[PDB]
Amino acid sequence: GLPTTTLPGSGQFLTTDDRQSPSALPNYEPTPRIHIPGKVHNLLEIIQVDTLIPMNNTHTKDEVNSYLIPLNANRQNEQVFGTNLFIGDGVFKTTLLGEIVQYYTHWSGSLRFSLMYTGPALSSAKLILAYTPPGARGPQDRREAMLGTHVVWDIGLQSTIVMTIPWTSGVQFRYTDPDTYTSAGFLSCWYQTSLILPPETTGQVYLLSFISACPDFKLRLMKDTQTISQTVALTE
Amino acid sequence: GLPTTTLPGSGQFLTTDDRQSPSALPNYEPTPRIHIPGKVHNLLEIIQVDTLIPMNNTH
Amino acid sequence: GLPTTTLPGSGQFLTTDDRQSPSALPNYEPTPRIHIPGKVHNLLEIIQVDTLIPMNNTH
Amino acid sequence: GYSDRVQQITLGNSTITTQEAANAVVCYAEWPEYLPDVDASDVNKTSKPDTSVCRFYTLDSKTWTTGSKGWCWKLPDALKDMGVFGQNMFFHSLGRSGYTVHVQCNATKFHSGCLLVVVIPEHQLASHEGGNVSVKYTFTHPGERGIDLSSANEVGGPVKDVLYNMNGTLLGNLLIFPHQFINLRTNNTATIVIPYINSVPIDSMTRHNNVSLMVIPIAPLTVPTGATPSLPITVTIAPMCTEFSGIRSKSIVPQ
Amino acid sequence: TVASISSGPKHTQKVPILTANETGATMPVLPSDSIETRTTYMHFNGSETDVECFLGRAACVHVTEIQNKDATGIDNHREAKLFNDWKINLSSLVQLRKKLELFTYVRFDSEYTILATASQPDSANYSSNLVVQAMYVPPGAPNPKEWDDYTWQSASNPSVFFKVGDTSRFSVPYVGLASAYNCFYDGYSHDDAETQYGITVLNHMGSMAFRIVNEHDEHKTLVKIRVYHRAKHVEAWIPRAPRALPYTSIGRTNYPKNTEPVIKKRKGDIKSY
Amino acid sequence: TVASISSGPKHTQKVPILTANETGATMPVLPSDSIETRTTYMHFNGSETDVECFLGRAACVHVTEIQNKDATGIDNHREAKLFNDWKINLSSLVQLRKKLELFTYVRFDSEYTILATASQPDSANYSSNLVVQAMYVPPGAPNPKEWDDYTWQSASNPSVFFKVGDTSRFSVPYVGLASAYNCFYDGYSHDDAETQYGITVLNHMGSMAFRIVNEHDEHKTLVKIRVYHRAKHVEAWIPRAPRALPYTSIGRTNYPKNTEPVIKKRKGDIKSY
Amino acid sequence: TVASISSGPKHTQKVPILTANETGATMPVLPSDSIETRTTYMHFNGSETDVECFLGR
Amino acid sequence: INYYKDAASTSSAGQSLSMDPSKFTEPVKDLMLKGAPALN
Amino acid sequence: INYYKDAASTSSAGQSLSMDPSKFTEPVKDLMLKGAPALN
Amino acid sequence: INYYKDAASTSSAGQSLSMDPSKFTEPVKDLMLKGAPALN
Ligand SMILES: Cc1cc(CCCCCOc2ccc(C3=N[C@@H](C)CO3)cc2)on1
Ligand SMILES: Cc1cc(CCCCCOc2ccc(C3=N[C@@H](C)CO3)cc2)on1
Known part of the structure; x- marks a missing residue:
């Protein structure tokens, strides 16, 4: 008989501990694995695939239309859309990125925001996208917007433009749930010159917008998502 | 005295676990084995012998 | 199963003991350290800096 | 002078040419291949009709109009009646296949509109009734007709609400599945190569569909002034590396 | 590892930021393709986002209840909770369910922890000390009928006996019939016109029975x-779109009717911040 | 190691005891610079004054209370202490607080011990045996609302279950967002005219929730x-002056008004012994 | 270990499927003696049918 | 590691991995070859 | 040290440290180079 | 012997045995020698 002493914590059950256990089914042989395409190893692998952002959130019931950012022909100087960058809330929240970020407490890294244009091929347009780093207000006019991170996008044969929100930060991690100290800025978009439709054409054209994370990205300290809850256990 | 911590499951009895136990009969000597024809090792050995099927179940 | 005996003191919590514990946050990666001037290692380092004595205590 | 843009796919006795492609997607970066022995379980030698089943079948055409919500086809169902592919299907106990899907929609440089073409492995549909109402067989086996998401709820059928992918997930995130867009201004076809994806090496072709192909208008169709307000969309699909096993009497399936 | 390299002004014919999303790719664009950057290192590995880590902590999957009382004159033990069961399954409680259904097929060993606590809602002199016996009853094995049937002998079926207030812990190998469990199944058990649709017909694995x-x-x-x-x-194989609407049933994808908009409406314009 | 060397009479032009304190230095003067000494050794290392030792013993940081009672008809579990929480923090109880605030920035892993004891202030037949479930609820995770919410499933959030009368112990890595925790912060969360001042806005880390x-x-x-x-x-970095006045609030430096003189007045003269 | 070997058409004078059960033997006939098979491996050892396992709980 | 002195006290035995059905499936005195005629 | 005989009884697995998003982010048939035109 | 995988779970650290008061006691720009005049 070897002398032992038990410490504080004996008998506790910590849902996060990782130890060995007896197998209830001694000697059982599991089914062989066969090959299946698509294996995922890290959630970091999947948040780099871009998905659509319901940017046009202004509706009243969920609709395919809140994915469409409208553009008006012949407007000059004006603003196309605006949003803050609380990736865990608001427009971002239902996107795959938003949806995964919510399983973690802290995030750090660059984001990739792209816009794909869908107007007739014989039209043309020049837009400016601007990222405003924390510390200033959402820009109120392009002059204000153009003094921060921006890209003049020229609509052409190449249909999409990929803007990166480079990680601009004092503190090396931000909270995924919106927090002030930790806030990330604003994203706005304005006409640089203006949309022009060809003859025989009319109305609004739309941009689709996507979001995905750069390879830069870090997420840490897992927790429970506000995105799902329940009141009684389900049954069959 | 070596410091320990006990985990969840301590004291449980799992009918399928396989561990050592003290022998109640210390030092006892079992009867020698003699040879007996017919030893079975796997149930897989015996399910290969065919047996009759009551196919005509209608009684 | 290895035979053990527990000694007096089992289960006690001594605020001054120093042992290992399971991490509640398995696999979490702490923020990198950056350099900060001023690191203290011993209280003996700081009690050698002189400070003023309110000698005139009479107020 | 090769462009990403022009392409030719020849499979069996049938060929497709596109002069306005946008590359092609190969699901999960894997190309269809036959079933290796190391992965095999059924001891039966399989049948590989090759060129008689691995050719291009063009399903009947759809009509995109400003009110369209989107269409959904299931595989191998959509092909249950195409030539010898279909016969093999009803006649063997098990079968396995990959596909090349080519979705076609051309317009002019004055039109606008953008379709999402996506392949969803194991697309289990939801009942519009809620609770634990099931979706009857016939409803998930529309055949070449596919399911029309702008048709009405029916009884025992699935829900046809587009912002929810027919299953409780948002349209916006379908982009995590192999997919390609058809943006009239860029593109006129979409091509996806689908490797066989299952948790078993070979399965039944009638009780289980392993992918739904979905074509969904996202930026509404907008035709030039006084143009007819609609465009046809055509889907052509070719089984590839098909294998059938466990031949017998010929399945009889509901309806 | 560098998180960002140093990059300076650019005036090229080589534009990495113009792409064609119609292709289905997400081109790997970085901050340094469109602004001037400085070197920085990652200092991080992505350890805690590994799927083993993501699905590897204990989640509550089931709460049931049984009582110890005189069975004298009880015509239906099962019905008196003289013992109860659980037609085993993992999609019953939703926190863990949403996590698993981020994938289509999943393969893993399970470690179960069972906590049992007692309550004495009406006048007792004391708290008794009860031993629970949770037993696995696979498909085909004779379900028990009374709280003290021959079934409980469990001569071939793994069973664990632990005390109320304590915890029992054991681990079961991956018992799936195929190579993976599907989290999801667009099929039937056969081509029947009225058979049930879904994984419910696949994910058939017995039930676990508890008694005092x-x-x-x-x-x-x-x-x-x-x-x-x-x-x-x-x-885990094949990632899918996360669950947006609430769940209604074990094993079907069905969502409730007249559910509420899941995308938050702006308080303001598209232009609003 | 010598604590003092031997030193004899001196009649020099080299005076180590005259200095200029205006410079900000504390010149390292020793007994042997001004009296005649003999050799002596230290016999000591300064082991128990290491900061790891100074901050390394368990200190009580929080006492809360919850009760087990029939929740039937309780409209606010939180309010009935059917379960309670703690918007986590270390500066709540002062013994440990004064110790930490001897430094400006501090970085460490934490080891928590949680002791739970039960009381039955009014007539009971017995003492029941309760299991506590303390769960970590980080910022953004859905706080629980009843004592038996879906929240308690805690499928992604670390939780420990232990028995009342026992102790639970686990250790959490340094969870700070920056490189160190500041013990102190002369800033705001943004340039707002009315936002709160202090570390309170930095030291944001969730809250811990307990229930039976x-x-x-x-x-x-x-x-x-x-x-x-x-x-x-x-x-630990940058030593500071020790706390002299009493504390009034978690996270602000504020002291109470009409506090008492903290320097003891002489009973006698400056000249008194 | 192979569970089944590959075997093709047969037109022989050597018939493994005709036997005389009166002898008391169970002749070791396999799928490949009477249909055309493909190779497959066992992937299994028969561990949990060992008598030690069967009587050991 | 055995902690105990007696052999009965050790854990379960380990798989025969013996397996030879012929004592049960082919106890015939003159060897039968599959493919050759049963009765000559 | 494993104390138990079966593999299911061992603790959690250890980090894939595999990580290759290209099956998801770039499943295109003809390789796309960043910087070269998307559609030629 | 660490029984646990993560570093936070290990016991207390071990004595700096670093000790250098000069950053606090003599942060002067031009070095002062004891015995030499303070102000020259
Ligand atoms: C997807 C998906 C994943 C799962 C989980 C399947 C679990 C396998 C079977 O689980 C058990 C549970 C309990 C016991 C048991 N044995 C006794 C000692 C007590 O409980 C055995 C197997 O179900 N669907
Ligand atoms: C300065 C200074 C130092 C600190 C302490 C910060 C502590 C980090 C977060 O602490 C916890 C506490 C509890 C749990 C917990 N997990 C579950 C098993 C139970 O409790 C997790 C993290 O705060 N300010």
């Missing part, structure tokens, strides 16, 4: 069982 | 939770 071994004392004792499940040795 | 898993017995049971915290792997 103790005979009855003078008062009644409520014992409530909580089963926790931890995946170990995880393997 | 047991349903109710016939009597009521008070369970009082004590959380102890031990720093391990300590790193």
